[PDB]
């Protein structure tokens, strides 16, 4: 009944030293029934990464929508959209559906190509921006993720250390949620290289 917890899933993002990390589970379900273990929730438009939790049809719809908008942006602007600008675009787009919203929990992550500054941001389903320095969480195990992130996180982690922290934050949060898990992906993002890692986790 509650649209935001029919399909299930989670996304988490973190900042490190000259790097950002964004991670998500791979589950898609119909309430109790597990349907797919290859439903990735992180997308990217140029060097800007977007994770989306919530109702899966809206996750797909919004990805297609932001691909649409960022492609037109690039043709007109003659440059790739930056994380700060994209964050404003997500907020605008969501709020225009104020009274008929997309049931989603988006998470932006990326590094500004000009300043080199790491950036993350979260949103509610209608556009409010949460621009945290440390971390952003989203999905059915957001409470769990808040608990993991708030204890495990420390500032200025190196890319390979940040990987371990975000991976353990996701995995242990997902294992305390019935509607999350069934695999996981972690993106480690640096100014001009991005590494994508699939995690081995319990398949129940």
């Amino acid at each position: 009944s509650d649209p935001s917890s029919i399909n299930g899933g989670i996304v988490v993002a973190m900042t490190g030293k000259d790097c950002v990390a964004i991670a998500c589970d791979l589950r898609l379900g119909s309430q109790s029934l597990g349907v797919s273990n290859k439903f990735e929730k992180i997308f990217h438009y140029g060097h800007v990464f977007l994770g989306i939790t919530g109702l899966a049809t809206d996750v797909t719809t919004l990805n297609e929508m932001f691909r649409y908008k960022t492609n037109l942006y690039k043709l007109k602007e003659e440059r790739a959209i930056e994380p700060e600008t994209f964050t404003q675009l997500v907020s605008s787009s969501l709020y225009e559906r104020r009274f008929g919203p997309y049931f989603v929990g988006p998470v932006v992550a990326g590094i500004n190509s000009k300043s080199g500054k790491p950036f993350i941001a979260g949103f509610d389903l209608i556009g409010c921006i949460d621009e945290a320095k440390d971390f952003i969480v989203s999905g059915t195990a957001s409470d769990q993720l808040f608990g993991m992130c708030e204890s495990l996180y420390e500032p200025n982690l190196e890319p390979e250390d940040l990987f371990e922290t975000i991976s353990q934050a996701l995995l242990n949060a997902a294992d305390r949620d019935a509607l999350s898990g069934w695999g996981a992906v972690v993106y480690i993002i640096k100014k001009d290289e991005v590494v994508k890692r699939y995690l081995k986790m319990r398949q129940d």
Partner: protein
């Protein structure tokens, strides 16, 4: 949320806490609730966070165009009128509860706004879940002919009352001072009485602690030449 507004000798000051909450969870610990409508008209917002943001941007945008059209600096009553009429039209469904303050060629002004579109005038005001804690402080310590230094003190004390006693409020105190014949000074994190203590332990993991299945480079670059 705790937000306040206090008039003084030569202007007006507004303040706010920095906690945003989804139910009993804190979404953001250092949230920015002081919004700029124009250079010398600022308002603080309580209620639905997207709404206070959106309604401020829209009116702020139209105020800017109006200022350019008329070749005059914007007035607080214009922002007030535009905000109330917008909110009334939406019959309370846009959940924005605002304290609007500022200085303009007419003088210094302080107003409140509720979601259904009703406005109120006052020398001291408070809104949000911690408004009762804040108003208790304001009713105990407010007087006529406050100085700038006294008004900032009173405003931040009123926010603190909200921070400590209201569970819907917390973290830091943001202030904005708008004095006549001066630039508005926005004091982000004016007080920081809630820094977290050092943790007992470091939870940095040994590298190779997490099990990995696959690795791959992601192509973020465009299609290449040659």
């Amino acid at each position: 949320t705790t937000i306040v507004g206090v008039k003084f000798n030569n202007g007006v000051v507004i303040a706010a806490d920095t906690r945003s909450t989804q139910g009993p969870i804190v979404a953001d610990k250092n949230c920015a609730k002081l919004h700029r409508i124009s250079p010398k008209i600022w308002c603080a917002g309580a209620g639905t966070a997207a709404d206070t943001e959106a309604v401020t941007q829209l009116i702020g945008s139209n105020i800017e165009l109006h200022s350019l059209y008329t070749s005059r600096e914007p007035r607080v009553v214009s922002a007030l009128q535009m905000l109330k009429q917008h909110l009334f039209k939406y019959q309370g469904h846009i959940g924005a509860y605002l304290i609007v303050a500022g200085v303009d060629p007419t003088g210094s002004h302080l107003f409140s706004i509720h979601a259904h579109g009703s406005t109120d005038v006052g020398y001291y005001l408070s809104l949000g879940s911690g408004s009762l804690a804040a108003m208790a402080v304001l009713e105990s310590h407010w007087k006529q002919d406050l100085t700038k230094e006294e008004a900032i003190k009173l405003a931040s004390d009123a926010i603190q009352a909200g921070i400590w006693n209201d569970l819907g409020s917390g973290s830091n105190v943001d202030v904005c001072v708008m004095e006549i014949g001066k630039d508005a000074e926005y004091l982000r994190n004016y007080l920081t009485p809630n820094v977290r203590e050092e943790k007992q332990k470091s939870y940095k993991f040994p590298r190779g602690t997490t099990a990995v299945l696959k690795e791959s480079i992601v192509n973020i670059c465009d299609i290449q030449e040659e």
